[PDB]
Amino acid sequence: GLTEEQRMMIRELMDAQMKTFDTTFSHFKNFRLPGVAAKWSQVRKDLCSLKVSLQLRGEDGSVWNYKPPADSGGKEIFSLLPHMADMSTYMFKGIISFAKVISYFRDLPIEDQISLLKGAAFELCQLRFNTVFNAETGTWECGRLSYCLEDTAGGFQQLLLEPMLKFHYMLKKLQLHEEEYVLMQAISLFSPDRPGVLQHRVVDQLQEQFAITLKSYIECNRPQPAHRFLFLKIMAMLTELRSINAQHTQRLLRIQDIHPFATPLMQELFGITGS
Ligand SMILES: CO[C@H]1/C=C/O[C@@]2(C)Oc3c(C)c(O)c4c(c3C2=O)C(=O)C=C(NC(=O)/C(C)=C\C=C/[C@H](C)[C@H](O)[C@@H](C)[C@@H](O)[C@@H](C)[C@H](OC(C)=O)[C@@H]1C)C4=O
Numbered sequence: 001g002l003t004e005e006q007r008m009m010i011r012e013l014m015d016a017q018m019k020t021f022d023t024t025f026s027h028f029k030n031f032r033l034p035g036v037a038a039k040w041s042q043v044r045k046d047l048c049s050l051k052v053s054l055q056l057r058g059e060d061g062s063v064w065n066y067k068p069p070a071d072s073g074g075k076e077i078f079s080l081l082p083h084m085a086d087m088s089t090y091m092f093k094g095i096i097s098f099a100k101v102i103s104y105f106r107d108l109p110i111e112d113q114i115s116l117l118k119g120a121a122f123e124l125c126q127l128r129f130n131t132v133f134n135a136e137t138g139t140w141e142c143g144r145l146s147y148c149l150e151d152t153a154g155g156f157q158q159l160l161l162e163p164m165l166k167f168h169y170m171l172k173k174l175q176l177h178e179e180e181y182v183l184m185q186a187i188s189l190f191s192p193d194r195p196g197v198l199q200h201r202v203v204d205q206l207q208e209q210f211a212i213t214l215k216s217y218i219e220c221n222r223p224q225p226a227h228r229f230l231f232l233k234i235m236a237m238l239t240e241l242r243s244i245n246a247q248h249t250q251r252l253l254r255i256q257d258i259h260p261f262a263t264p265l266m267q268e269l270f271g272i273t274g275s
Pocket residue numbers: 046047049050051052080081084085087088091092122125126129140147164165248249251252255261
């Protein structure tokens with residue numbers, strides 16, 4: 001059974017999620033849209049994991065649909081960078097508000113709150129994006145905005161080679177509850193091994209508490225044989241998400257060095273100083 005203090009942890013996390021996750025993206029406004037050396041080969045490969053079409057459903061009932069251009073060894077590959085930067089900044093703001101609401105997070109020193117956010121901002125955004133991912137149609141449904149994957153060789157199987165895309169399909173197949181999602185966000189946020197963290201011992205003790213609560217939650221509410229080892233499956237996904245976060249950070253900094261795109265908030269989260 002869940003202890004009274006374990007139920008207390010879930011309530012505060014669910015409360016922080018309810019207050020800071022705009023599930024309909026109704027406040028995502030004024031975003032940019034596409035127009036009406038060996039570094040580039042890596043940059044061409046880094047961005048070629050896009051292949052995503054975009055749909056705006058109008059409030060009046062109209063629909064705008066965008067189909068991306070093909071790779072032509074030119075500049076067209078940067079067409080969605082400004083829009084993805086605005087979407088990321090919107091989600092990053094939501095992640096920062098989520099952590100600030102949590103009491104266990106607000107009680108840490110300011111220097112460590114910054115270090116934990118800089119290290120987990122991407123991972124918490126991926127976990128929130130998974131809850132709006134439609135694995136049947138390969139589409140992230142962000143309210144009036146939709147991001148649909150376009151067919152690109154070997155159907156969905158040659159697309160699952162992309163680690164970020166494989167993560168979303170595998171995490172969605174576990175059919176997690178809202179409480180399990182917010183506990184994964186807490187475990188990833190309170191990672192003591194993030195660079196720059198001073199209170200390692202405290203953040204580690206908090207992370208173990210969040211993992212124990214998630215473990216106990218699964219034992220009490222999922223007795224089916226399909227959910228055997230579900231806690232261990234979840235922790236394996238969080239380990240893979242940390243690896244994807246490291247791969248993604250390097251691809252981000254390589255593109256920024258060739259073609260600037262990062263908003264001021266992203267520059268702050270990835271260490272760019274402006275000089
Ligand atoms: C911080 O990352 C952001 C900014 C990157 O800047 C740039 C410059 O560097 C990137 C790196 C390193 C990448 O590998 C990729 C992109 C970009 C950038 O444009 C990209 O444009 C599209 C990719 N692929 C896709 O189209 C896929 C597979 C799915 C399409 C739609 C989904 C709805 C999204 O994937 C979201 C689930 C989310 O992942 C995405 C909004 C993400 O924002 C966040 C907060 O995670 C940004 C990519 C991709 O592979």
